[PDB]
Amino acid sequence: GPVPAGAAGAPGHEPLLGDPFGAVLRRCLDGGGTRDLAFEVVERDDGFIIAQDAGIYFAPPGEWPPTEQWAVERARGRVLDVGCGAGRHGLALREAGLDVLGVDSSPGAAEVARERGLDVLEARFTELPARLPDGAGPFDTFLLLGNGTGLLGTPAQARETLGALAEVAAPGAVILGDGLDVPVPPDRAAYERWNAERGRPEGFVRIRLRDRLLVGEWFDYAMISPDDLGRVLAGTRWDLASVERAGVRYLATLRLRD
Amino acid sequence: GPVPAGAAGAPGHEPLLGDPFGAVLRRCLDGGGTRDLAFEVVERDDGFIIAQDAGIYFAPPGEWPPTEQWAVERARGRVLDVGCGAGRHGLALREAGLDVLGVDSSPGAAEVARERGLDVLEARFTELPARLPDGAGPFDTFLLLGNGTGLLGTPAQARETLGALAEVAAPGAVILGDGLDVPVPPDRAAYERWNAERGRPEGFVRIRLRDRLLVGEWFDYAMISPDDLGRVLAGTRWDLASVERAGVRYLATLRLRD
Ligand SMILES: Nc1ncnc2c1ncn2[C@@H]1O[C@H](C[C@@H](N)CC[C@H](N)C(=O)O)[C@@H](O)[C@H]1O
Ligand SMILES: Nc1ncnc2c1ncn2[C@@H]1O[C@H](C[C@@H](N)CC[C@H](N)C(=O)O)[C@@H](O)[C@H]1O
Ligand SMILES: [Cl-]
Ligand SMILES: [Cl-]
Ligand SMILES: [Cl-]
C-alpha cells in the first residue's frame, strides 16, 4: 500500500521555470570546477529523483569514458560541439589547435564555456542554421558526446536536430556520437507501462532539472542502442557508418549522405 | 513574470513516502563509502532543491567540523549517539573503546550503521524510554551532532525530545550538541514571511528528503543560536553549561539537573 507524499509548493512559493543547469555549472566553476561543489538534480515526470556531481562537466580528457576520448582524438576540420554544456569536449580540441564552435541553449552554460575559452553560440539545435553567423562553419565534425545520442530525444525530435546539423555540414561531414547499450531493468517496467498508456515511445523518460527554486523545461531522454540509432536515421541525411563499443558504452560514427 | 513549473506525479506514478535516507546511505556503503557515489537531495516545502554528497556520513574524524571532533574527543561513559545516521560518530567512539549505542528512526540508516560496526536501536527519540532494552543505558553522554540542536525542531518538539533523553540519562549526564549560530539569512526573507503568514516559528524551514520515487516525511530544521537554545532549555531538566565556538558553528554542553 503506497502512500503518496504530495507535492511541495504553493502560489507565490513554488519552483519557477529558469536555467538550473547554467546556475549549477556557474556555482561549480566559481569554486574551481572540482567535485562536491554543485550537483545536477534530475526529476522524472513521476517524481523520480536522481543527482550527480556537476564536476563531471569540467573534468579533463583523461577522466572521460573511452568513447568520449576516442571521439575527440579523431575529430578533424571545423568542429561543432553540439550541446557543449561547460565545453569540456570542444575545449580539448581548441587546445589541440582545431577550429571549434559550441552550441547550447542554456545561457548559463554558454557563459561558463566561454569563460573556459570556447566560442559558444547560444541557440537551440533547431535554430542553428538561422542563427549561425557568417564565417562560422560549415562543419566537418559534429560532437554529440556525453550520451549525445540519448540527448537527441524521441525519434521526431532526433530527426529535427539531425536535419539542422546537416544544413550546416560540409561535404563528407561526420557526427561522433556516443551512447549506452544497456538492457531495460524491471524498475522502468512500471514507467514503461505508463508510457504505453500515454501513447509515448518506448525506452524514453521525461525529465527536467531542479536547482534552488529554478526548474528546466521537460525534455525526453533515453539510452539508445546502436540498432535503434540506425533506425532513427532511416530517411535522414546520415548513415550509421561504424559502431565501436567500450563495454556498455559505444561510439557511433554517422556519415553525411550529402 | 516568472512561469511556475508545475508539479510532477500522477496516481500510481508519483513520489511515495518511504526511507530515502536509508536508500542513499545503503547505495553509498555498497560502493565503498567514498564520495561521488550517492547524493542526499533535500526539498523545502516551497520546492527549493539542494543536494550534497552522501560521503560526508562516512567521512573520517579529521574531515568532521571541529565542533563534532571536540564532542567526540570528550565523550565518556555510556554513550548514546542520538540520530546516528550511518554511525560515523559512534563508530569512532567504539574504536576508542567506549560503550556506544546509536539510535535512529530510519531503518536503512540503522542497517547501514550496524553493518559498519555500531549497535543501533531503531526508534524515534520520544520512543527511547519504551524501546530501550534492559541491558542498555543509563547514558552519561548524549551525542547530538550534525547540527543536532537544529534537529530538535520547534520548542515544543525539542522539549519532548529532551524529556525523553532525560528519562534514560545517568545522574550528571551531559548532552554534547552542536549547532549553527547564523543571523537572519537574507536569502530566506521571503520564506520567513511565509512562516509568518502560516503562523510557524521564525527561523525554521520545512524540508524533506527525495531519492528515486521515495520521499521522507516533512520535518522542521533550523540553525538556532546558543541564546535561543538556552531559552528552549527553560523548564527542562537540562542546563546550558558551556558553549564552544568555531566560527558559525558551536558546541553546547547541556548538563542534567540533579
Ligand atoms: N534542444 C537543445 N538545443 C540546444 N542545446 C541543448 C538542447 N537540449 C539540450 N541542450 C544542452 O545540451 C547540454 C547537455 C548536457 N548533458 C551537457 C552535455 C555535454 N556535451 C557534456 O557532456 O559536457 C546542456 O547544456 C543543455 O543545455
Ligand atoms: N525523531 C527522530 N527520531 C529518531 N531519529 C531521527 C529523528 N529525526 C531524525 N532522525 C535521524 O537523524 C539523522 C539526521 C542526520 N542528518 C544526521 C546523522 C548523524 N547525526 C550525522 O551527523 O552523521 C537521520 O538519520 C534521521 O533518520
Ligand atoms: Cl505529469
Ligand atoms: Cl573520497
Ligand atoms: Cl539491520
Tell me which chain B residues have a C-beta less than 8 angstroms from the C-beta of A23: none
Q: Which atom belonging to ligand 2 lies closest to the Cα atom of B147?
A: 22
Method used to obtain the model = X-ray
Asked if B85 contacts B147 with a C-beta cutoff of 8 angstroms, the reply is no
Alpha carbon distance A7, B209 (integer Å):
13
Please report whether residue A2 resides in a domain. Answer: no
A118 and A22: one domain? no
Reported structure resolution in angstroms: 2.0
Please report whether residue B199 resides in a domain. Answer: no
The identity of residue B164, as a single letter, is A
Handedness of CA A124, A129, A135, A139 (dihedral sign): positive
The identity of residue B81, as a single letter, is D
CATH number reported for the structural domain that contains residue B116 in this entry: 3.40.50.150
A146 and A130: one domain? yes
CB contacts < 8 Å between A and B, how many?
Answer: 126
Please report whether residue A154 resides in a domain. Answer: yes
Alpha carbon distance B121, B130 (integer Å):
11
Q: What letter would DSSP give residue A34?
A: -
CB contact under 8 Å between A9 and B14, yes or no, is no
A258 and A163: one domain? yes
CB contact under 8 Å between B9 and A47, yes or no, is yes
The number of distinct structural domains making up chain B is 1
B4, B48, B215: residue with CB nearest A212: B48
A76 and A157: one domain? yes
Asked if A181 contacts A225 with a C-beta cutoff of 8 angstroms, the reply is yes
Map residue B199 onto helix, strand or coil. coil
The 3-state secondary structure of B143-192 reads EECCCHHHHCCCHHHHHHHHHHHHHCEEEEEEEEEEEECCCCCHHHHHHH
A2, A7, A16: residue with CB nearest B2: A16
Alpha carbon distance A177, B139 (integer Å):
61
Asked if B102 contacts B119 with a C-beta cutoff of 8 angstroms, the reply is yes
Helix and strand numbers (H, E) in chain A are: 9, 13
CA B107 to centroid of ligand 5, rounded, Å = 7
Alpha carbon distance A17, A40 (integer Å):
16
- CA-based nearest residue to B41, from B210, B220, B206: B210
A237 and A169: one domain? yes
Q: Give the CA distances from residue A41 to residues A103, B46, B110, B200, in Å, rounded to whole numbers and listed in that order.
A: 22, 16, 26, 29
- CA-based nearest residue to B41, from B21, B15, B59: B21
Which ligand ends up closest to the CA of B102?
Answer: 2
A99 and A206: one domain? no
For residue A41, give its domain range. 10-58+186-221
Please report whether residue A157 resides in a domain. Answer: yes
Could you give the count of Cα atoms lying within 13 Å of A82 in the half-sphere of its Cβ?
31
A87 and A208: one domain? no
- CA geometry: angle B118, B122, B125, nearest 5 deg: 110
Please report whether residue A4 resides in a domain. Answer: no
Alpha carbon distance B13, B94 (integer Å):
43
Handedness of CA B108, B113, B116, B121 (dihedral sign): negative
A87 and A173: one domain? yes
- CA-based nearest residue to A79, from A64, A90, A65: A90
Q: Cell 539542494 appears where?
A: B50
Please report whether residue A209 resides in a domain. Answer: yes
The identity of residue A144, as a single letter, is L
A214 and A252: one domain? no
CB contact under 8 Å between B44 and A7, yes or no, is no
Neighbours of B30 (CB within 10 A): 12
Asked if A54 contacts A48 with a C-beta cutoff of 8 angstroms, the reply is no
Asked if A78 contacts A141 with a C-beta cutoff of 8 angstroms, the reply is yes
Strand A169-180, strand A249-256: pairing? antiparallel
Asked if A123 contacts A137 with a C-beta cutoff of 8 angstroms, the reply is no
Beta-carbon contacts of A25 under 8 Å, excluding residues fewer than 6 positions away, are A38, A54, A57, A85, A86, A106, A108, A109, A112
Residue ranges of chain A whose CB lies within 8 Å of a chain B CB:
2-5, 7-10, 13-18, 35-36, 39, 41, 43-53, 55, 190-191, 194, 208, 210-213, 215
CB contact under 8 Å between A49 and B211, yes or no, is yes
Q: What are phi and psi of B244, to 5 degrees?
A: -120, 125
Q: Cell 537574507 appears where?
A: B186
Chain B residue with Cα closest to A20: B49
Which ligand ends up closest to the CA of A59?
Answer: 1
B53, B191, B213: residue with CB nearest A47: B213
Q: Which three cell numbers stand for residue A179?
A: 551512447
Please report whether residue B150 resides in a domain. Answer: yes
A96 and A129: one domain? yes
Map residue A238 onto helix, strand or coil. strand
A133 and A146: one domain? yes
CA A232 to centroid of ligand 1, rounded, Å = 20
Alpha carbon distance A49, A208 (integer Å):
10
CA A206 to centroid of ligand 2, rounded, Å = 33
Helix (H) or strand (E) run with residue A258 in it: none
Through-space distance between the first and last CA atoms of chain A, rounded to whole angstroms: 57
Please report whether residue A102 resides in a domain. Answer: yes
- CA-based nearest residue to A204, from A138, A141, A157, A254: A157
Asked if A22 contacts A108 with a C-beta cutoff of 8 angstroms, the reply is yes
A81 and A42: one domain? no
Is position B104 annotated in a ligand binding site?
A: yes
> What is Dmax (Cα atoms) for chain A?
62
